[PDB]
């Protein structure tokens, strides 16, 4: 019938839009994990540096 056409113009948009917004809610969240990981990768190198420098200084000093 004619009401069955109407349910199909909607039922198409409301999956196109909600599939799109579940891949932005994916995407932001993927970059959020890859940032936190990298802000701790730079933190890891820094600490190392400070320890290699530190020990050399105490060897020289002594």
């Amino acid at each position: 019938k004619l009401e069955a056409i109407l349910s199909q113009e909607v039922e198409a948009e409301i999956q196109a839009l909600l599939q799109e917004a579940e891949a932005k809610a994916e995407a932001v969240k993927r970059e959020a994990e890859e940032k936190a990981k990298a802000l701790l990768q730079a933190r890891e190198r820094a600490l190392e540096a400070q320890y290699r420098a530190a020990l050399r200084r105490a060897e020289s000093a002594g």
Binding site: E13, L17, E20, A21, A25, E26, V28, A32, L39
Partner: peptide, 22 residues
């Protein structure tokens, strides 16, 4: 209307969850 709602109310969650994680 529910389509647009729960699109925005989903991305909303992710943006907030990205802040609190960092």
């Amino acid at each position: 209307e529910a389509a647009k709602k729960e699109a925005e109310e989903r991305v909303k969650r992710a943006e907030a969850e990205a802040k609190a994680l960092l």
